[PDB]
């Protein structure tokens, strides 16, 4: 049984949903930008047009007040691109804006986020807003595993989340911004990744969730509350080695 530097983790075999590894998997903690996976699912569940040009809007998200972003308020970009920026780059204004263009309004969006959690058996999970900036967006490694299992039903989420980088062009006014994936493993050919999302807040620590393949075995990996910007990636690498070869490695 390998040791991890992070506060909690869970790895599941996606062939059978069997738990391969668990470390404090029921510890309830904030999850930061991992929230954006749920946000993406809520958008797709309603089958809102992906090509629709939407305005950046943070009116109803008090958690975004005074938070820096390069995505300008009232500028426009497609729903699909907002999903992309939210998932690949953890762009908060893009995630927030998605909830401002939802049938029934912003609070209907939050209801849908919590309704899905319940429907997925994520009984220790709560969402209050779509970005993950709120310390009240909480879950457990076990619940996040359920979210990952459910993400298999949303191929676009996986596609978009693994995009290495892209230039995003906005309208009103015309400007282009460079964006890059928060997970550098998408640039490493020895990693086979179907879905990725990172997160960081001091309350949540560094967080990482992935759907990946280790020697033909598809797995769902969750690492939460890592101190140090590479500690969660180091944990993931050490667990991979253990899964693939059986060799337990110490925590450096």
Choose the catalytic residue: 36, 75, 89, 161: 36
Residue 80 among the catalytic residues = no
- Contacts of 158-164 with C-beta under 8 Å, sequence gap 24+, read 158/194, 158/195, 158/211, 160/40, 160/80, 160/83, 160/84, 160/87, 160/88, 161/37, 161/87, 161/88, 161/195, 161/196, 161/197, 162/88, 162/186, 162/193, 162/194, 162/195, 162/196, 163/84, 163/88
Cβ density class 181-197: b for 16+ within 10 Å, e for less: bbbebbeeeebebbbbb
When divided into structural domains, the chain yields a total of 1
Going by C-alpha positions, the residue among 15, 7, 4 that lies closest to residue 218 is 15
Residue 75 among the catalytic residues = no
Distance (Å, whole) CA 92 – CA 113: 16
Choose the catalytic residue: 8, 33, 97, 134: 33
Distance (Å, whole) CA 155 – CA 36: 15
What are the phi and psi torsion angles at 161 (to 5°)?
-65, -25
Hey, what are 9's tokens?
Answer: 């983790």
Residue 33 among the catalytic residues = yes
Distance (Å, whole) CA 48 – CA 198: 25
Contact yes or no for 226/23 (Cβ under 8 A): no
Going by C-alpha positions, the residue among 199, 190, 209 that lies closest to residue 229 is 199
Structure-determination technique = X-ray
Going by C-alpha positions, the residue among 249, 217, 220, 214 that lies closest to residue 235 is 249
- Residue 92: domain span: 1-252
CA distances from 110 to 43, 62, 71 (A): 11, 14, 22
Hey, what are 19's tokens?
Answer: 């738990």
The residue behind tokens 């391969």 is 20
């Amino acid at each position: 049984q390998p040791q991890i530097a992070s506060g909690s983790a869970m790895i599941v075999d996606l062939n059978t949903n069997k738990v391969i590894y668990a470390s404090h998997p029921d510890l309830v903690r904030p999850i930061a930008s991992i929230t954006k996976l749920m946000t993406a699912m809520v958008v797709l569940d309603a089958h809102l047009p992906l090509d629709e040009k939407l305005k950046v809007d943070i009116s109803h998200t008090p958690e975004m007040k005074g938070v820096y972003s390069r995505v300008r308020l009232n500028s426009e970009i497609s729903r699909k691109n907002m999903l992309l920026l939210a998932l690949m780059s953890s762009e908060n204004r893009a995630a927030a804006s998605l909830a401002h263009h939802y049938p029934g309004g912003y609070d209907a969006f939050i209801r849908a986020m919590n309704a899905k959690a319940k429907a997925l058996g994520m009984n220790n999970t709560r969402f209050v807003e779509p970005t993950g900036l709120s310390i009240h967006n909480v879950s457990t490694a076990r619940d996040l595993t359920k979210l990952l299992i459910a993400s298999k039903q949303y191929p676009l989420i996986g596609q978009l989340s693994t995009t290495r980088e892209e230039m995003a062009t906005f309208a009103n006014p015309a400007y282009t911004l460079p964006f890059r994936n928060t997970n550098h493993l998408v640039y490493r050919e020895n990693w086979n990744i179907q879905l990725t999302k990172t997160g960081f807040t001091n309350a949540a620590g560094h967080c990482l969730v992935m759907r990946t393949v280790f020697n033909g075995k598809p797995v769902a990996l969750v690492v939460m509350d890592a101190f140090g910007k590479y500690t969660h990636f180091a944990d993931a690498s050490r667990l991979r080695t253990w899964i693939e070869t059986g060799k337990v490695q110490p925590v450096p």
